[PDB]
């Protein structure tokens, strides 16, 4: 399995503190059946800046350690890009990373709102042949209060990625119920860990897949898992017709 959003790189954001932590997360991920992680450290204009070059280097150094430790996990470069107006431009100038240098870009909204220009930015990105993937939309306060915001973005071509832990219920029963609403409505195209540690923000990968199979049947979790395989090798993903979200 391919995990497309994860905070396993050390000394970069709220994720792994040092290499020991990174190794413990990798072991956790192996136990969940994950074999490849696209590292996506937080990248923002003030609080956390994590430059493409530094990400690539931390990922390569972590891989060397994992080969050393005989851990069968491979780490690839990416970023969790906090949305800003100039994403298309900076991407062209290689000042941002897409997920494994593919067409898919992981873009995060601020926690409490969806900036109005998102639709326009995402249209511009698509014209350049990029596909924006919305990070953890179930954790966005405004999408929570007004889930139609997500229906429209996805209909206009955006993909989104749900957090395994949200479906596993580790963030409350409320966040779980909302997450399932989003999946039913076909607004979700990937499941990923967003793992930060092995304590409170662990992977919950198998737990999430099991919840999906019980709620929807065996084909839907299989499709989501396969979307990650397609993303990694820069191929088109499977989409289902989006719909409005039930209360
Ligand atoms: Fe985030
Ligand atoms: Fe994240
Ligand atoms: Mg974080």
Swiss-Prot record:
Changing residue 3 to A: Large decrease in activity. Inhibited by vanadate and sodium pyrophosphate. Not inhibited by sodium fluoride. GO terms for molecular function: manganese ion binding; protein tyrosine phosphatase activity. Optimally active at alkaline pHs. Activity increases with increasing pHs. Keywords: Hydrolase, Manganese, Protein phosphatase. It catalyses: O-phospho-L-tyrosyl-[protein] + H2O = L-tyrosyl-[protein] + phosphate. It is an enzyme of class 3 (hydrolase). Its cofactor is Mn(2+). It comes from the Bacteria. Its EC number is 3.1.3.48. Belongs to the metallo-dependent hydrolases superfamily. CpsB/CapC family. Dephosphorylates the phosphotyrosine-containing proteins YwqD, YwqF and Ssb. This is Tyrosine-protein phosphatase YwqE. It comes from Bacillus subtilis (strain 168). The lineage of its organism: Bacteria, Bacillati, Bacillota, Bacilli, Bacillales. The gene is ywqE.
């Amino acid at each position: 399995m391919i995990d497309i959003h994860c905070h396993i790189l050390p000394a970069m954001d709220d994720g792994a503190g040092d290499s020991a932590d990174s190794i413990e997360m990798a072991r956790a991920a192996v136990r969940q059946g994950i074999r490849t992680i696209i590292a996506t450290p937080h990248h923002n204009n003030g609080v956390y800046k994590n430059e493409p070059a530094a990400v690539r280097e931390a990922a390569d150094q972590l891989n060397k350690r994992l080969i050393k430790e005989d851990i069968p996990l491979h780490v690839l470069p990416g970023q969790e890009i906090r949305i800003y107006g100039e994403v298309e431009q900076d991407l062209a100038k290689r000042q941002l990373l897409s997920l494994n240098d593919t067409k898919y870009i992981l873009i995060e909204f601020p926690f409490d709102h969806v900036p109005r220009y998102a639709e326009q930015l995402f249209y511009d990105l698509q014209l350049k042949g990029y596909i924006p993937v919305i990070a953890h939309p179930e954790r966005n306060r405004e999408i929570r209060e007004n889930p139609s915001l997500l229906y429209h973005l996805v209909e206009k071509g955006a993909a989104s990625q749900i957090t395994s832990g949200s479906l596993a219920g580790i963030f409350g029963k409320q966040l779980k119920a909302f997450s399932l609403r989003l999946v039913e409505a076909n607004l979700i195209h990937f499941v990923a860990s967003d793992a930060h540690n092995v304590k409170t923000r662990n992977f919950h990968t198998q737990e999430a897949l099991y919840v999906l199979e019980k709620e929807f049947g065996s084909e839907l979790p299989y499709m989501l898992t396969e979307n990650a395989e397609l993303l990694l090798r820069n191929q088109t993903i499977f989409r289902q017709p989006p719909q409005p979200v039930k209360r």
